[PDB]
Amino acid sequence: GYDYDYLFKIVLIGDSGVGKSNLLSRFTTDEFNIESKSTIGVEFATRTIEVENKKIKAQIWDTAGQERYRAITSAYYRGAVGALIVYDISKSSSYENCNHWLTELRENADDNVAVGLIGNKSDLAHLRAVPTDEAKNFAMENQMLFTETSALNSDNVDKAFRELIVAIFQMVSKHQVDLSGSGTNNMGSNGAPK
Amino acid sequence: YHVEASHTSRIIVPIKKIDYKKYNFENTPIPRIYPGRQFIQSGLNEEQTIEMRQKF
Structure with a gap:
């Protein structure tokens, strides 16, 4: 059937050409029967983990920037609870508007979100457009999880997703107690009197 | 030499060149x-x- 317990939606946001979609395909189920990207914009991918003996279903919506869909993207951040700003260390002008993406996403997403920040294409570490310690600091006074992804090793990004779903889980972890259902008696022949 | 309180005195120091096939x-x-x-x-x-x- 379906049988999962919770379902989160997590946007991937950034500038175009920073390498979000190639980052998405390697670590998660992909190319199921999705028509494509740009036909409607913002492709959807799914990931199924379990936390604390609860099953979690996560939908990742890699936002697409083409200027034409800018009005459409606003409506797609409505209700968005998990977030990931991706930036590349090779090019440098994405980091000038990474703060703008954070501002636009603090606006009209939820009451509270948990935004990660991830450096794609660390295979070109020598070509470092921005120092990692500055982005690490900018994550530190913005309450953000910070990652550096090789794009050739998927362990880092997979670890980031597991910890992000943990922090967003405890945030919404509704209290649960028990569903045991063992209390049985009263098998008589009913000498009733009304 | 002698420089009193404002009087500049241009020292003329002779050196040689350097050779471009000797240093890189x-x-x-x-x-x-x-x-x-x-x-x-x-x-x-x-x-x-x-x-x-x-x-440099």
């Missing part, structure tokens, strides 16, 4: 005092890097 002046440029650091892109043209190396 295209070696690792502007060496850092301590090794390591961020290792960010230079952000300058290779030709500019040549003249900055010579002028």
Whole structure:
């Protein structure tokens, strides 16, 4: 059937050409029967983990920037609870508007979100457009999880997703107690009197 | 020499040249005092890097 317990939606946001979609395909189920990207914009991918003996279903919506869909993207951040700003260390002008993406996403997403920040294409570490310690600091006074992804090793990004779903889980972890259902008696022949 | 309170005195120091086939002046440029650091892109043209190396 379906049988999962919770379902989160997590946007991937950034500038175009920073390498979000190639980052998405390697670590998660992909190319199921999705028509494509740009036909409607913002492709959807799914990931199924379990936390604390609860099953979690996560939908990742890699936002697409083409200027034409800018009005459409606003409506797609409505209700968005998990977030990931991706930036590349090779090019440098994405980091000038990474703060703008954070501002636009603090606006009209939820009451509270948990935004990660991830450096794609660390295979070109020598070509470092921005120092990692500055982005690490900018994550530190913005309450953000910070990652550096090789794009050739998927362990880092997979670890980031597991910890992000943990922090967003405890945030919404509704209290649960028990569903045991063992209390049985009263098998008589009913000498009733009304 | 003698310089009193404002009087400049241009010292004329004679030296020789240097030989371009004796020293290489295209070696690792502007060496850092301590090794390591961020290792960010230079952000300058290779030709500019040549003249900055010579002028240092």
